[PDB]
Amino acid sequence: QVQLQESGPGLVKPSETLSLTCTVSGGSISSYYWSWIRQPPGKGLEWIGYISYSGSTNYNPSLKSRVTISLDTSKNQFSLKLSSVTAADTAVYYCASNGQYYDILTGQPPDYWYFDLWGRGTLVTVSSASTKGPSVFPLAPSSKSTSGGTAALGCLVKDYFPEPVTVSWNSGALTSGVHTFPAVLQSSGLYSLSSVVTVPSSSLGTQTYICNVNHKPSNTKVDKKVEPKS
């Protein structure tokens, strides 16, 4: 079985073009129908179109003459171009296919598209308000957060416009109690979020609790330690 991955241009200024490439990389491929599907954040799925290895395009009649799926059989890559982007193209875009052996000598064409293999998705937004980096503060463990056996501490990462941002705890070590809350969109137009984790109150400062903030559209990487209040 192969696996698929994408590579878009993060953001996009309005009425630009959209560039996404989905590179097949696995063992022996057996697919014949490479499709992109679309998903607005917290809304329903939507199928964009496919391309076949016979070069037989097919598109959804709600994005016609805005989509063009190409196919480069010298890199094992295919790609999708959305020209004239609009504000309603805020979505995560997947590339998906069907890992099934292909014989027209036994079988009709609409037998090979139920989307077995799946990509990983890449967020996008017809924005343009340029980009920015996050500002980080540590929210210290305190007795007002402490209760009995446990106490909570976290990291507040705020004011950034590149939606995909990640905060880990101790380079990915702590998975207990670590909970990153959904980012919030302020009136200023920038996002903000806070990730918090609980840890035994006997262990306020004892061990390492460093939040690793990484901003992938930019190249921001900062580690912040959280310690009890002075």
Partner 1 sequence: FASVYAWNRKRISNCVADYSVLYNSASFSTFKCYGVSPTKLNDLCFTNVYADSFVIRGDEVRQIAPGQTGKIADYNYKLPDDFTGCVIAWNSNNLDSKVGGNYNYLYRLFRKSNLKPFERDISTEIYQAGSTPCNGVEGFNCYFPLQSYGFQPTNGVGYQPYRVVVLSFELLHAPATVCGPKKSTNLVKNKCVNFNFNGLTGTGVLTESNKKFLPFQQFGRDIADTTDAVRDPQTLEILDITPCSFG
Partner 2 sequence: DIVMTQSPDSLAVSLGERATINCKSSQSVLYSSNNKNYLAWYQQKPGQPPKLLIYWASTRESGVPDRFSGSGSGTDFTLTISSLQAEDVAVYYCQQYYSTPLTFGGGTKVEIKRTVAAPSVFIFPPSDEQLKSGTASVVCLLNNFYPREAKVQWKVDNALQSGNSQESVTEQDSKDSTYSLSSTLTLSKADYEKHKVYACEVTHQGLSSPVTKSFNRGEC
Alpha carbon 191 to its chain's center: 16
- 130 near partner 1 (CB under 8 A): no
DSSP string, 76-101: TEEEEEEES--GGG-EEEEEEE----
- 65 near partner 1 (CB under 8 A): no
Amino acid at 165: V
- 108 near partner 1 (CB under 8 A): yes
For the record, the structure tokens of 154 come out as 């976290």
Amino acid at 230: S
End-to-end CA distance of the chain: 55
Question: Residue 120: which of partner 2, partner 1, none does it interact with, CB under 5 to 8 A by kind?
Answer: partner 2
Applying CB under 8 A, which part among 13-21, 70-78, 130-138, 207-215 lies near partner 2? 130-138
Task: Kindly report the number of other CB atoms within 10 A of residue 57's CB atom.
Answer: 14
CB of 20 to partner 1, least distance (A): 21
- 61 near partner 1 (CB under 8 A): no
Angle CA(85)–CA(59)–CA(32) in degrees, nearest 5?
120
CB of 28 to partner 1, least distance (A): 6
What is the DSSP pairing of strand 150-160 with strand 191-200?
antiparallel
Q: Which of residues 70-129 bind partner 2 (CB under 8 A)?
A: 94, 96, 110, 113-116, 118-121
Binding site for partner 1 (CB under 8 A): 28-29, 52-56, 58, 73-74, 76, 104, 108-110
Binding-site ranges for partner 2 (CB under 8 A): 35, 44-47, 58, 60-61, 94, 96, 110, 113-116, 118-121, 135, 137-140, 142, 144-147, 150-152, 154, 156, 158, 179, 181-184, 186, 192-194, 196, 198, 229-230
